[PDB]
Symmetry: C12
C-alpha cells in the first residue's frame, strides 16, 4: 500500500501537471497564431501559468517522495 | 491504510489544482490575445481566481499531509 | 480505512471545487474580455457564484475531516 | 463503512460544484451579451442553483448519517 | 456494506441530478439571453424538464435510502 | 451485495436517465430560442424522446428495485 | 455473482439512455434548421432508436438472465 | 463469476453498441436537415454503417453469452 | 477470473470497436452531405479506414476468446 | 494472471481503435474539402496508422507474453 | 502481481501512444489542406512531435518489458 | 504490490506525457498552417512547452523506477 501510494501520488499527479502545462502552452500558441505582435506579453503570461499549473503536482511528488522514503 | 490514502488525496488535488489553474490562465491568455489593450485589469482578475481555484485542492493537500502522518 | 475514506472524500471535493471555480472565473475572464465596462458587475456576479460553487465542496471537506477524527 | 460515507459526499462534491459552476458560468455568459436587463437573469440563476444543489446535498445528508 | 451501497446509489444520483438540471438551466439562460420577453415560456419549459430530470435520480435516491436501511 | 447490486444498478441508471433527458430539454430550449413559432412541435418531439430516453434506465431501475426485494 | 446483473443493466442504462438521447437531440436540431421536413426525419429517428436501443436491451436480457 | 463476467461484457458492449449507432444516425439527420435532396443516398450509407458499428458490440455480447453458457 | 478477463477484454474492446468505427462513418455522412459528387471515393475510403480501425480491437478480441477456453 | 492479459490487450484495443479512427476521420474530411490531393492524403494515414497502432500492437504482444 | 502490473503499464501506455500521435496526425491533415505546397515543412513538424508523443508511452512499454524480469 | 506500483506510476505518466506533448504539437501545427512566415517562433515555442509538459511525467517515471530499483 505504501509502495502503491508513492506510485499513485506521483502517477495521477503526472497527468495533472502534464496536461496542465500542455493546456497553457496550446493557448500561448493560439495566442501567437492570432497575433504575432504579442510574442513577449504572452510569453511572460505563459511563464506565469506554467509554475502554478505545475505547482500542485510537484507537491504531490513531495508527498510521493515522503511515502517513498 | 495508510500511506496510500494520503497519496491519492494529494494526487487528486494535483489534477484538481493543475487543470484548475490551467483553465483560468488559458482563458487569461485568450483575454490578452484578442484584447491586449487591457492586459493589466484582467491580469489582476486572474490572480484573484487562481487562489480560489487552488483553495479546495490545497485544503485536500493539507489533509493529505495530515494523514501522513 | 477512515483515513482512506477521508482521502477520497477530500480528493473528490478537490476536483469539484477546483474546476468548479475554474469554470466561473474563466467565464468572468472571458466576460471582462468582450466588455470591460461591466468588469465590476461580473466581478460581483463571480463573487456570488463562487460561494455557491464552494458550497458542496466545503461541506464535503468537513465530512472528510470528520471521518478522520 | 467509513469509506462509503466518503464517496457519497465526494460524488456530491463534484456534482454540486461543477453543477452550480456551469449555471453561473452561463449567467456570466448571459450578462456579456446584451445585459440591458441584468435583473431578470439574476433571478433565473437564483432559481436554478437550489434545484441543482438539491439532490447532491440530500445525497450528502445520507452520507453523514451512515458515517457518525 | 449496506451503507456503502447507499453511497454509490445516492452518489451517482448526486452527480446525475446535479449536472442534469445544471445543463437545462444553462440552456434556459442562453434562451433568455437572446430574448428577454421570452423569459416566461422558457421558465415553464424548464419547469417541465426539471421534474423529469429529477425523476430517475430521486427514484434512484429513494431506493438509495432503502439500501442503507 | 444485494443492497450493493440495487445500488450500482440504480446508480448507473441514475446518471443515464438524468443526462439523457437533460440534453433533450436543452435541445428543446435551444430549439425554441432560434424559432419561437415552433415551440409546440419540439415539445411533443421531446415528449417522444423523453420516454425512450428514460425507457431503459427505468427498467434498469426496475431490476434494481427487484434485486433489493 | 448476481452482482454483475445489476451493473449489466446499469451499464446498459447509461448506454441506452444517452444513445437515444443524442439521437433525439439531433432530431430537434433537424426540424429547427429546416422546419418543413419534420416528417421525413421523424421516421428516421423512429428508425435509429430501435437499432440504437437494440444492443442495450439484449444486454438487459442477459442481465435478467444473470439474475433469475 | 461467469455470471458476473457475462454481465459486464454485454454491459460494456451495451454502452458501446448504443452510442456507436447513436452517433451514426445523428450524422444522417445532420445531412438531411440541411440537405434533404439525397435522403436515399445517405440512408443506404447509414444502413451500411450501422452493421459494422454494431458488429463488434454484438460479437461482444456473443462472448458474453458464451462464457455464461 | 478467466470469464471475467474475457468479459472485460471483449467488453471494453466493444466500446473501442463500436465508437471507433462509428466516428469514421459519421465523418463520411457529414462529408458526403456537404458534397455529394464524391460519394464513391468516400465509400472506398471508409472501407479502407474501417478494417484498420477494427484491426486492433478485433485482434484484442481473439485474445479475449482464447483465455476463456 | 488471465485478468491482466485481458486489460493489456483491451486497453491497447481502445487505444489503437480510436487512435486511427480520429486520423481516418481526418483524412476523409480532408478529402471532402479537396479532392485533387486525395493521393497525398492517402499516404499520410498509411504513415500515421502504423505509428498509431505501433504502441497498442506491441502491448498486445506483451499481453500474450505475460500469459506465456 | 508482475504479470498483472506489466499489463496495465503497457495498456495505459497504449492509449497514450496511440491517441498521442493520433492528435498529431489529425492536426497535420487540417494543416496539409491549406496548402500542400508547404507539405514538407509540416511533415517534418509531425515527424518531430510523433517521437515525443510516443516518448513516455514507449518507455512505459519498456517498464512493461522490464517487469518481465 | 511494489511491482504493481512501478507499473501504474509510469503508465499513468504515459497518458500524461503522451497527450500532454500531443496537444502542444497539434496546436503548433495549427499555428504554422495559418501562416508559416513565423515557423521559427513557434518552433522554439513548442521546444519550450514540450519540456515542462514532459517534466512531470518523467519525474513520475523516476519515482516509478525508484520503487522498482
Amino acid at each position: 500500500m505504501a509502495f502503491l501510494g508513492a506510485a499513485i501520488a506521483a502517477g495521477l499527479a503526472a497527468v495533472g501537471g502534464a496536461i496542465g502545462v500542455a493546456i497553457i502552452v496550446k493557448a500561448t500558441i493560439e495566442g501567437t497564431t492570432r497575433q504575432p505582435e504579442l510574442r513577449g506579453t504572452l510569453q511572460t503570461l505563459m511563464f506565469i501559468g506554467v509554475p502554478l499549473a505545475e505547482a500542485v503536482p510537484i507537491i504531490a511528488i513531495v508527498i510521493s517522495l515522503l511515502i517513498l522514503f
